[PDB]
Amino acid sequence: SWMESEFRVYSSANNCTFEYVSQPFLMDLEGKQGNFKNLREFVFKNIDG
Amino acid sequence: KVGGNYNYLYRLFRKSNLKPFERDISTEIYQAGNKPCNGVAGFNCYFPL
């Protein structure tokens, strides 16, 4: 059960001026005794930039 | 300048009118003729910028 550090998703970058490093979005609540899981819900929309 | 400042470029040809508050810095060769624009330049193949 040891697996992590995949990284290197992309190959190269270019001109860009947007950076929003911040606190993470999803939090995994502790699940115990089985039959107890959290359903992550996400919706994304794009209007007027 | 007296010789002319050619440091400014503007798009002239596009597939369709863009939505408000959008950016498109892509450079390519618009299909302005029946013959497909292979590359470089030529007749019926206009460079937009």
Side-chain angles (χ1 to χ4, degrees), chain A residues 1-2 4-34 36 38-49, chain B:
Chain A
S1 288
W2 290 341
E4 292 177 350
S5 64
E6 63 181 1
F7 55 81
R8 266 285 299 160
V9 63
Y10 61 92
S11 73
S12 172
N14 284 298
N15 304 110
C16 58
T17 312
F18 182 76
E19 310 288 320
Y20 195 108
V21 68
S22 294
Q23 207 266 329
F25 292 169
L26 55 88
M27 309 294 137
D28 198 282
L29 303 172
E30 164 65 25
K32 39 185 170 57
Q33 323 300 321
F36 182 76
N38 51 342
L39 183 63
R40 268 93 178 281
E41 304 263 21
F42 292 91
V43 58
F44 320 126
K45 48 185 276 194
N46 182 21
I47 59 170
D48 56 79
Chain B
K1 293 211 309 287
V2 57
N5 204 331
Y6 296 8
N7 269 14
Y8 298 125
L9 311 173
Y10 74 99
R11 185 175 295 287
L12 189 56
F13 301 92
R14 207 166 192 279
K15 297 207 69 75
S16 302
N17 306 343
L18 73 165
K19 275 151 151 74
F21 276 14
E22 305 212 343
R23 179 193 277 99
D24 194 12
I25 48 184
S26 301
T27 176
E28 60 87 20
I29 297 169
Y30 184 47
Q31 174 79 72
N34 307 329
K35 179 179 70 178
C37 291
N38 279 350
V40 179
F43 188 60
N44 290 330
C45 284
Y46 292 116
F47 182 61
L49 268 74

